[PDB]
Amino acid sequence: TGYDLSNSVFSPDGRNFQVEYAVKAVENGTTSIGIKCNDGVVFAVEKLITSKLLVPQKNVKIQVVDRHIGCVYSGLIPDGRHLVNRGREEAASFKKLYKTPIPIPAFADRLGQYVQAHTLYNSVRPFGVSTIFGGVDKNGAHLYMLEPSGSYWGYKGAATGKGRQSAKAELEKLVDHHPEGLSAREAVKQAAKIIYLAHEDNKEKDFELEISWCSLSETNGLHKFVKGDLLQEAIDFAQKEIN
């Protein structure tokens, strides 16, 4: 055999084992989710508090691309940052040439093509992150999720990390119970709950919640972090649901 030792090598199955091995690193990472809503998107992430010595609110994992796109990821954090840095260059050159800010589907492909490129050669390693991202453009709200293979799809709700199955199950219930749509302020509250429910699969260390959102009405189509009263309101809502 030895098919799994090198990237970009097809096994007899037709599989790239190195990419599947990269997925294991994503599964090992903390839980992160994305919720599409009426006029925007909401992102949330589980931050494991390894120690008391960690400064609260000052290890921000969610990143902004341009002024209208939000990115969150699970797995190897540095790999996620590298991908976002590329995304920012892609979005910058798009706006430079075409004036208009990059559309989300356009942006999604720019990342997708880049991640896929890292499965074409043995001289590079695949990305050890699944990336949930999206925002608001001229055509409305969009949520995406991108995997180590370069595969991505549009989503109503997205989840990845160690508590992905728990989060997915909870996301599926929202889609069923809200066919006409979920509001932006509701999605923030639901996002908090789902992270707290998904924390049951990572309950040794206690955690810190971090939420962001894009919304045509609430944030004026721009990406902003959920802070202060709105954040604490969402935490209290989640605390009430687990008990």
């Binding site: 090598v9 199955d13 599409k36 997708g112 050669y121 370069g150 595969s151 599926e172 889609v175 069923d176």
Partner: protein
Amino acid sequence: GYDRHITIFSPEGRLYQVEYAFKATNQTNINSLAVRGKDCTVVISQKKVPDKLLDPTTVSYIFCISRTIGMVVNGPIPDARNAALRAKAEAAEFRYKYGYDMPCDVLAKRMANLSQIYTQRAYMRPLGVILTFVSVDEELGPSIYKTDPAGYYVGYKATATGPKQQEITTNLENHFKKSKIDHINEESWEKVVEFAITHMIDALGTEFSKNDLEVGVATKDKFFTLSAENIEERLVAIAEQ
């Protein structure tokens, strides 16, 4: 056995990486079909959306390469999109350099030559996809040209691709034995789509709803995909006969 890891010859004269790239083609478990009318070329593909959280409008293996050319892919979506983007760039460059729209067969050959390079050059892996190009060419008329990981390509009267490709192929073979012609003798593209869907139902033995199918249609001077309601309207016509 490193002759199975990169694209070099085995003792029996084979490229195992090319052969394994063919097996990656069926990884999506989707079957596609392409047929030609008089004025049009229709391509249909199964649409499977297993996850409930997915946005079904974004799940597509059919691409609009140029205004005139359409392409359906059998294989993983990352390699599919890789091929799509390249074909789009090639079709656009062609028009700029040579002053006319790139023909379907020329694009197919170009993409096939790129695929061939991956079978000879070691650092590049083959794409695990089969590309089916369709158009209504201004010189050759309705056209179907298909490319694979080996760098092979050829024109088709009709064609099928996927896990249950053989069952669809023989179904179509038996029809053209009977009709005694190279195409679907039909005026409107609407009925050519109805033919395509009907014969896929017979071959695969499954029934289809509006969301189980994905349809692309090539006419003169434009290629376009059908919406769920366009397909639904089409499925109603089949059922009422």
